[PDB]
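Researcher: Batch entry, complex prediction.
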Amino acid sequence: VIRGDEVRQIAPGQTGKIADYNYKLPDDFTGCVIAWNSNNLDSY
Amino acid sequence: LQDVVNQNAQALNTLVKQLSSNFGAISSVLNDILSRLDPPEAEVQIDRL
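Model: Structure tokens for the complex:
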């Protein structure tokens, strides 16, 4: 689960709290990233 | 005989002087470009050189 604010960081060669301390993707990643709003299910 | 020495020295001098050319890189110094540019695009810059 991530927040739309900085949700775009899940991508090769990105910087930020998520990409630098939580989940970092390699530069030559091959595959697809999928996301969807989950307000109805998830909304500390 | 002097022309052989002159031509070899000149070709060699041109070969070393080519290291000052940027070829479109932000800068011709590999360490300078690598020290301030993130790898995913420093690769693009260094490839030209």
